Write a protein that binds this ligand. Structure first.
Ligand SMILES: [Mg+2]
Ligand SMILES: [Mg+2]
Ligand SMILES: [Mg+2]
Ligand SMILES: [Mg+2]
Ligand SMILES: [Mg+2]
Ligand SMILES: [Mg+2]
Ligand SMILES: [Mg+2]
Ligand SMILES: [Mg+2]
Ligand SMILES: [Mg+2]
Ligand SMILES: [Mg+2]
Ligand SMILES: [Mg+2]
Ligand SMILES: [Mg+2]
Ligand SMILES: [Mg+2]
Ligand SMILES: [Mg+2]
Ligand SMILES: [Mg+2]
Ligand SMILES: [Mg+2]
Ligand SMILES: [Mg+2]
Ligand SMILES: [Mg+2]
Ligand SMILES: [Zn+2]
Lengths: 122, 114, 53, 216, 120
RNA sequence: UUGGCACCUCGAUGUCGGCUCAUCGCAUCCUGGGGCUGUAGUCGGUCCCAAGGGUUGGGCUGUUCGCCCAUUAAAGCGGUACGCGAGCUGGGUUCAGAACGUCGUGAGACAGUUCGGUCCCUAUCCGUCGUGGGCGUAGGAAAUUUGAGAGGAGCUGUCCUUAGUACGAGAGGACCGGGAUGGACAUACCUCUGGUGUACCAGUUGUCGUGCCAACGGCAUAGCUGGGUAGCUAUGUGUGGACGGGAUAAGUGCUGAAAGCAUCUAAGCAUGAAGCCCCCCUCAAGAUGAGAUUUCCCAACUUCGGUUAUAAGAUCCCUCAAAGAUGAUGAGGUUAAUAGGUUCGAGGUGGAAGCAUGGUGACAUGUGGAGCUGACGAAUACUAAUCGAUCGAAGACUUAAU
């Protein structure tokens, strides 16, 4: 359950380390986003030398949340952290590597490249 | 019991091939992934931190550290999507809910074996 | 807030239409013949349900 | 078009053919009998009156609703049935398909039927505007003396009154509620129960009325 | 369960006092709501007494008060001893229902419904 | 809007902005339907019909405005004492303090600035939201009901296919039709995920007790801490705004004269909007126009007008909860499972006490998924729902038909 002002770890090597959520995309008055949703965000913290710089306004797909997600079979998945991956306009990641496990819902979202790069898909 | 009619109508949903286990036991849960038409078994291995409910509604939760990130999977105990459960290890704990492990990492999060 | 107009006798007594108490729920004691409250011990003779209390 | 009366037992779940988790309500719908048949000629409209849940026979010094009184006993005896706890009419059915005195079994519905369920919602007693009407609170701090109040009830000289329909505190719940387009998940004829997908109004033991869904 | 116009600790304390008083005197006059609450407490104590084992005696000690009862023979016994002795022996063959409540009517000072609750 | 006027109010009509709650208008921001286009397509421009629903979070500033960030189908314009302070706030503004610039000889002053600065009221009436009693509805009752009326609801994105088709040099790229899945909103509900859970279980500190040990109790926010049943719950689980019909708007036409032609109009016949009336949901016969159906009760005495206690029935009183401020509603009242107790369970906690064993010991292991357990399921008259009392019909007249 990610809303405006939520901070998230960046699970990639794009250069961003932590982002602050500016907007939940996908409708007027939409309050929260979860795994597989896209957010507009600003980079609060970055690794020196990366492609993405501090203060950049970028788009990210949520890949892990503490809230987790519920599945049609009544099972659940939850993570210890809220993490996102910075994406291009075609849903491809800005970086070249993904870190940490990601939820399978990314497949239904068609973030296939992120899913492929992810070390584990749960 | 619970209400007789609820039990009577849900009796056939219960599975009889599940091993005994307790919170703190390490489990290997073989889960059927049915993406598209292809079916495969993915194993989720972790410590049982929670069991709750009764009858067909019962659930359990298993916790693992994956790539340095904790991951918790909660299953209906009688879901047909679990092919089988293996009790890899019996843990020694002092309480039913192991929520304190969520805040522990590394050697601090180790469960003594029985 | 305060009454804008005084309350007439007619209006006051209309309001008091329902301000009253009822006769108690009482019956004659089968033992001693005195009135008692139903489901209560009879205070005159101390009996309830044909036995002394 | 079908109809039946039952009691809400409670909620549970079933696993579907693909392992999906299906929340269900258990409705016990035993002892439904057609007590009366209303027709356009006699009553002005067509309907079947169904009586549900046998109660005890009339007795001289009855003190509760557990025992049928003489009017109810005569009404039921005309259909040759035991007196019933609940009586409801179904106008949506074909009257010609029923006979007075007939049993109405849970087997009239089949798994997959889309249905409307009507009940009386749980009562909440006297409730405020936030709970009853879902209004916003005022601030909890910053000097506020407005937390759970209902807000302004009108304007001013225009209109020097509160309009009808103004939302205010009062008794909440206990309303007739229809939930449309639920589904029959299963029918268990041995136990006389219907599993309805999802949740339906009212407390446990509350009367529920199941009909073929009106929209199609 | 009733709250009896008291906070949680006060209500627990009053129920312990009332239970011990009923054990001692075998019949007490009190308010109706108090009697309806204390009947459960007293009868669970009776159940412990009938069980009779050391665990039951200690569980009962958790609830009973420390009160000395002077018998007719100048001998003294605690309420716990009375409960696990004569009261338990008395109700060996009875399955529940160890108390009864007899309504008396409102009292003068506040109109509260006075009742008598007694053993047996 | 800025004003003009000075007609109500100076034995007081609280004044900006925000919050809460809206309500109305249409001169329409979006969505719906159209005409014209310098409308190829995709887009647009402009005008007409249309008020059903919808019409976002933030940065700055007291701000309204306004600019900006990021969205959205869209981020409408106005009225309601520039709606709403006996609903809230009190940042600005408009008291007393102090200060700066400035003016003034000065006391002081400034739609100049600055820092600080008391927001009262138990609702009588109408009004509004709930909830009872009386009588009426030509006998007295129990249920089931019709629906005159009234209220609710009414919004929309994206993607897939048609089709990379029509159109277009190309770039790009459809109408119409058929599917899937969302946002916001509404409603019910607790199986699931969670929250709470002060008479559930467990760990634990200090101190005072139960004579001591052991085991327990009191107080320290429920001492604190880890969990948690029912209930109540959202952020959780379901469901909804679907499919249509009738009459229309702006329009679009057919046939057609006045007026040999022409002409949607005069007669006549079609078609045509998220809008109107329905369809969907809820209330509803105090609908005094008081409606309908089924079932129940039905005699004596009379000054022969009428009365009577009784009948069917319903209450008082009592045990209660799915109901609840209280009334009311519902489950029960011995020919009884209504509550308590008792017994067995579910769920929760997580291994009681005692004893034994191993350790110098703190402790550990066994007995033994033990012991305990509010609300949830079942059984059982052991306790209490005793004995009683009260209310409650005998059916008006006229006419017509039989
Ligand atoms: Mg306050
Ligand atoms: Mg007016
Ligand atoms: Mg205390
Ligand atoms: Mg003049
Ligand atoms: Mg005046
Ligand atoms: Mg217009
Ligand atoms: Mg509109
Ligand atoms: Mg104003
Ligand atoms: Mg005012
Ligand atoms: Mg101020
Ligand atoms: Mg001035
Ligand atoms: Mg100050
Ligand atoms: Mg729940
Ligand atoms: Mg539950
Ligand atoms: Mg202590
Ligand atoms: Mg003390
Ligand atoms: Mg002290
Ligand atoms: Mg032991
Ligand atoms: Zn007497």
């Amino acid at each position: 359950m990610i809303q405006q002002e939520t901070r998230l770890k960046v699970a990639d090597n794009s250069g961003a380390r932590e982002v602050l959520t500016i907007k939940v995309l996908g409708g007027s008055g939409r309050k929260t986003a979860n795994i597989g949703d896209v957010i507009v965000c600003t980079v609060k913290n970055a690794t020196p030398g990366g492609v993405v710089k501090k203060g950049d306004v970028v788009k990210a797909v949520i890949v892990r949340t503490k809230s987790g997600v519920r599945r049609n079979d009544g099972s659940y998945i939850k993570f210890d952290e809220n993490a996102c991956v910075i994406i291009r306009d075609d849903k491809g990641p800005r970086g070249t590597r993904i870190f940490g496990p990601v939820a399978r819902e990314l497949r239904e979202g068609n973030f296939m490249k992120i899913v492929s790069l992810a070390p584990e898909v749960l | 019991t619970n209400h007789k009619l609820i039990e009577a109508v849900t009796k056939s949903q219960l599975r009889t091939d599940l091993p005994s286990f307790r919170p703190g036991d390490t489990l290997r849960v073989h889960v059927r992934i049915i993406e598209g038409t292809r079916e495969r078994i993915q194993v989720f291995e972790g410590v049982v931190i929670k069991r709750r409910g009764g009858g067909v509604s019962e659930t359990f939760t298993v916790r693992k550290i994956s790539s340095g990130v904790g991951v918790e999977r909660t299953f209906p105990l009688h879901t047909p999507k679990i092919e089988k459960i293996e009790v890899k290890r019996r843990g020694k704990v002092r309480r039913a809910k192991l929520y304190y492990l969520r805040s522990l990492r590394g050697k601090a999060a180790r469960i003594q074996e029985i | 807030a305060v009454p804008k107009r005084r309350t007439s006798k007619t209006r006051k007594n209309k309001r008091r239409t329902h301000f009253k108490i009822s006769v108690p729920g009482m019956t004659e004691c089968p033992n001693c013949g005195e009135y008692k409250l139903s489901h209560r011990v009879c205070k005159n003779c101390g009996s309830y349900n044909g036995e002394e209390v | 078009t079908k109809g039946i009366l039952g009691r809400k037992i409670g909620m549970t779940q079933v696993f579907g053919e693909n392992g999906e988790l299906i929340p269900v309500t258990v409705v016990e719908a035993k002892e439904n009998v057609v007590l009366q048949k209303k027709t356009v000629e006699v009553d002005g409209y067509n309907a079947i009156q169904v009586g549900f849940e046998d109660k005890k026979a009339y007795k001289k010094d009855a003190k509760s609703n557990k025992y049928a009184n003489k009017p109810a006993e005569g009404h039921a005896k005309k259909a040759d049935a035991a007196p019933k706890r609940f009586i409801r009419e179904f106008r949506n059915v074909d009257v010609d398909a029923y006979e007075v005195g007939q049993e109405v079994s849970v087997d009239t519905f089949v798994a997959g039927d889309v249905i409307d369920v009507t009940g009386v919602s749980k009562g909440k007693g006297f409730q405020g505007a936030i709970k009853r009407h879902g209004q916003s609170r005022g601030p909890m701090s910053h000097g506020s003396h407005f937390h759970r109040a209902p807000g302004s009830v009108g304007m001013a000289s225009d209109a020097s009154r509160v309009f009808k329909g103004q939302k205010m505190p009062g008794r909440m719940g206990g309303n007739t509620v229809t939930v449309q387009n639920l589904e029959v998940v299963q029918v268990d004829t041995e136990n006389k129960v219907i599993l309805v997908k999802g949740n339906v109004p009212g407390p446990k033991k509350g009367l529920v009325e199941i009909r073929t869904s009106i929209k199609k | 369960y009733r709250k009896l116009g008291r906070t949680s600790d006060q209500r627990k304390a009053m129920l312990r006092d009332l239970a011990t008083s009923l054990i001692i005197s075998e019949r007490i006059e009190t308010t109706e709501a108090r009697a309806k609450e204390v009947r459960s407490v007293v009868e669970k104590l009776i159940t412990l007494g009938k069980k009779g084992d050391l665990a039951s005696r200690r569980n009962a000690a958790k609830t009973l008060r420390n009160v000395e009862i002077l018998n007719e023979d100048e001998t003294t016994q605690t309420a716990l001893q009375k409960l696990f002795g004569e009261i338990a022996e008395r109700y060996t063959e009875r399955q529940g229902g160890y108390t009864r409540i007899l309504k008396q009517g409102p009292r003068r000072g506040d109109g509260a419904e006075s009742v008598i609750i007694e053993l047996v």
